[PDB]
């Protein structure tokens, strides 16, 4: 159905990788290596869980490397559509590859795209990271530590609780089985993505604040880039056949801030015990409902 080699070429060219080579890969690897060595522990302690596999490797990517490493995983997001097609391919490849090449000049790291996030290492696309830092007049050190913290947080959220990816893979299979039925699926995927961001943004405030003097500055400046990441993450879902709609922000963050204010981090950590403990989109809009439901458990 899709010519993936046309797509690959289209992606490589639109990414304009040649114009954004990584400078000083050597000291950047040093920087990230030590920022993760610090990060993992601080996050492990705050969340009371460890990674099944400590982050023992880190990769500093340019746009070309990001593409070479993600194109197969990307195409595979289309398997449900390409099989279902069996039971122009060039022009499709041009469009999908184009969109992917576009993503290559905006992605900053490992967990920017949920469908690609579905262990033992982390990568950073330093070129785009450097361009954002400078366009926002931010601190070299502070922004990259901010990014590392954000990155490690999501690694924990996706890997510290084994059921998360299983449950995420479950939800994907569900959707493809074909209505209030499909909406239930979207509702769940949407609520999971929301909690992952909100809980992740909560850990940022609690661990990143103590270590980033420009923290307030960054959160302010990065605001629009976050709105952007959300739109592109959603775009990837619709492209592959999940015409759902992600939630802005605060929606999932205010949920967590609310309950944490109302009962503490330990209580709020209950959302990580099982898929059933994740709030519905409704509960995210009204945490109270969730707090009550968790109370009735046991």
Widest Cα–Cα separation across the chain: 57
Arch. (CATH architecture) of 1-111+120-125:
Up-down Bundle (1.20)
- Structure tokens of 88? 């122009």
Method: X-ray
Distance of CA 53 to the CA centre of its chain: 19
* Neighbour tally for 248: CB within 10 Å: 13
Tell me the structure's resolution in angstroms, rounded to a single decimal.
2.2
Domain with CATH 1.20.150.30 in the chain: 1-111+120-125
**22 Ramachandran zone, left/alpha/beta (phi>0; psi -120 to 50):** beta
The three-point CA angle 219-223-228 to 5° equals 140
Q: Calculate the alpha carbon distances from 45 to 48, 71, 114, 147, 171 in Å.
A: 5, 35, 25, 19, 30
């Amino acid at each position: 159905l899709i010519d993936w080699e046309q797509a690959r070429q289209a992606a490589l060219r639109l990414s304009q990788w040649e114009q954004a080579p990584v400078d000083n890969r050597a000291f950047r690897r040093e920087q990230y290596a030590r920022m993760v060595a610090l990060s993992e522990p601080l996050i492990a302690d705050y969340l009371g869980v460890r990674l099944p596999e400590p982050v023992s490797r880190i990769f500093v990517f340019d746009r070309r490397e990001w593409l070479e490493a993600n194109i197969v995983s990307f195409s595979q997001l289309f398997r449900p559509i390409e099989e279902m097609y069996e039971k122009s391919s060039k022009l499709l490849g041009v469009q999908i590859g184009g969109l992917l090449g576009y993503l290559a000049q905006r992605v900053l790291g490992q967990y920017d795209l949920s469908l690609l996030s579905a262990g033992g290492s982390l990568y950073f696309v330093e070129p785009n990271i450097a361009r954002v830092q400078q366009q926002l007049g931010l601190s070299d050190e502070d922004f990259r530590l901010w990014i590392t913290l954000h990155e490690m947080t999501h690694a924990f959220e996706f890997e510290a609780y084994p059921w998360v990816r299983t449950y995420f893979r479950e939800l994907l299979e569900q959707n493809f089985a074909l209505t209030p039925e499909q909406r239930a699926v979207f509702d769940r995927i949407q609520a999971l993505m929301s909690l992952i961001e909100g809980y992740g943004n909560h850990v940022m405030n609690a661990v990143g604040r103590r270590l980033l003097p420009s923290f307030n500055q960054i959160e302010q400046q990065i605001a629009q880039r976050q709105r952007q990441r959300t739109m592109l993450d959603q775009m990837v879902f619709r492209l592959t056949g999940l015409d759902l709609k992600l939630a802005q922000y605060q929606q999932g963050e205010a949920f967590v801030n609310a309950v944490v204010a109302a009962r503490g981090i330990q209580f709020a950590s209950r959302v990580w015990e099982r898929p059933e403990n994740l709030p519905s989109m409704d509960e995210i809009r009204n945490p109270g409902q969730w707090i009550v439901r968790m109370d009735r458990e046991g």
